[PDB]
Symmetry: C2
Subunit: 419 residues, 2 copies
Amino acid sequence: MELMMAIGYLGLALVLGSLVAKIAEKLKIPDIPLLLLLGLIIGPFLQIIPSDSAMEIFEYAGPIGLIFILLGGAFTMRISLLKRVIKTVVRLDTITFLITLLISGFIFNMVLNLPYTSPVGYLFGAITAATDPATLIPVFSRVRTNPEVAITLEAESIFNDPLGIVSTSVILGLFGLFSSSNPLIDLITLAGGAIVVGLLLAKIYEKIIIHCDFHEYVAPLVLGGAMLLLYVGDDLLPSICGYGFSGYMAVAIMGLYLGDALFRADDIDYKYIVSFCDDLSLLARVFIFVFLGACIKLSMLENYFIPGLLVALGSIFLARPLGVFLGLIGSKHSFKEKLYFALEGPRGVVPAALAVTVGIEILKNADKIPASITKYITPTDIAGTIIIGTFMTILLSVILEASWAGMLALKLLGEYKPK
Amino acid sequence: MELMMAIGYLGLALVLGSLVAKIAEKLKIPDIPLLLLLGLIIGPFLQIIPSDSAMEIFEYAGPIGLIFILLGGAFTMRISLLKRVIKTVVRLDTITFLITLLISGFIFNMVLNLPYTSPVGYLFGAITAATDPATLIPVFSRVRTNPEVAITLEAESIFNDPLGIVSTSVILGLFGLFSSSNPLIDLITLAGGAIVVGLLLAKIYEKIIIHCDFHEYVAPLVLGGAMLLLYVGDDLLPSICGYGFSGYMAVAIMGLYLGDALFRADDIDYKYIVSFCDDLSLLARVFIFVFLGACIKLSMLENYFIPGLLVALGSIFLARPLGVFLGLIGSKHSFKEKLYFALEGPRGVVPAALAVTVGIEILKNADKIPASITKYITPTDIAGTIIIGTFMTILLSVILEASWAGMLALKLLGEYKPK
């Protein structure tokens, strides 16, 4: 665990990563594939980090990294704003999200030939359903859409954030359950709890900021404040109850409300935040993608390469696209938004940790207690697949979206000519 | 080691600390005493953290924290610039520094009544001699001196940085030695090595930055690059040789050269760096002072309260002031610079870690192997004292300097009337 090694490797990551990111900025190309390639080079190719070690580092670093990008993603944008294309945004985001997860459960189960009740398939499907913004919707969205869509993508992103947790709970229930007591209270408690206290601080922050003085001192407040939300949510309240409120959704809600409350007010106290959050959110994303890669255990992969690839294509081309086409149908229009609903595959911040976290949770405790469910299916490959599918999942979703985003941003000027 | 607790406590530190720092900015008062008071409140008073735990966290966090403030301190200023009052600055900084350490060795030994050859006293004296800038010379120096003195204070700060390490080596030699092989190569190897590679990157950085493109991407480069310097210096090269170059002096030299090389060139690529480094350097200093406090083991303190207090007064009033008065004597002038040489007691970033690091190193390995030197003196109190003396040391040096800095900045306009 030698510290000097940790700061050394972290140093190499910052030095090489900053340079590569800058080259990308002067190259137009989007970060993510370059981040993954770097992850391979310092990963399998040069053998600079193994699986066990990568996962061990990630157990500590990941929550810190995740708090960074969630905070960075929130501040790089706003709210109020969101309420005009919003009917489509909420119906499509919520209803199409649940349907996509359902689609994910079924194909993943069938391709393996494993039983439908079996939970591994439904987990894989659950991972596909989750979106993640923060790595790519905010990074391309620095520059305009300018219509509806940027706000929605943010909303979709965050909207899931209340969804990804719900999906994780569902996956926990059916793949066997550590606790069978609630299939419903946990949904309430996490979302509702995160909403209440998040609004509590956003309101508190709203008043305290407007009355005075920090300005500048507002940054430690949320960064420590967000930190407390995790401690209260996933450690303190489960300890004192088994009753927790999560934390992640709670900080998401706080950022969502607070950004709007700040922006809504106007005045001198807004410029600076966009640049600061963009710079901050960059280091974490570079580090997270590579560290997300290194967290996975070393040797994944040979057996489940083909299925995960096949599962991925179903999510990108069938589940995603059917979702948008069957979730927007009442639109105008068109041929620009419904297609956007399709192609999904942006999330990768949530499900990633959850994929790996579930992987260690079931695989390690397997010998000690694997709820005796889906053992002979056999899971060994469930844990293995999820990670590649998400990898593959990021790469192809990220690569394709990055390649056609400009074409789908301007090329689709809606051809609306009113005179 | 539960992560959620770590990010939770860290979160509380950021939230409360940012607010307190902002209040201070709107209050004029200087951070440091407030940081120490907070450290007490979450320390002994409320029992939020113990010694063992605080030191355990500090072993990991401290090198990360130390890299932050060293980098922040460098960028908040420049170089080239330093070369006009510089004769006084180098003679006073170097020659008065060694003399101060010598003074520290003697009084500390005598007050205990322990033997002069005995190394514990010379360690205590060594700790007094070390200065540390970064926490208070840069923080007050955001606003002008405007003469000579700000540049010197920076130089004194950094100049020691090559000195604090030398002092630590000297302390290691005489308080018993793990290795008796070199009392001279280590001085060369650390300083010389840090100089060479530091200049290597500063030159490399100088060319690569001027030719292109990062701008913004220069921040990861040094932050990872600085990280590698620690790994190469205090882990890799000692492992592959027993031959190390430190790292800290090396990153200090790199920052010193690079800041000047960047500033010397001029052009659009300088604004932004001052604000960025100031903001970055703040979080670390708040966290470092409180975390420096929490690193020390719980129960220090009752036996050696009085001596450390007495040792402190000798350093502040006798060793410091004799040093400046006997180190400047050839000045003009006057009654404004010689007095500044006196009052010392600003350092607290280096000796702190070194104080605690030596404390664990000798106290823990004592039963296993305490080089059998100064055991019956007895050390138990050496380790205990150093920490309080440095605490006391920061508080009184920081409090007094902060109180009279304005008076000594303008009140001493040199009364120079040339016509």
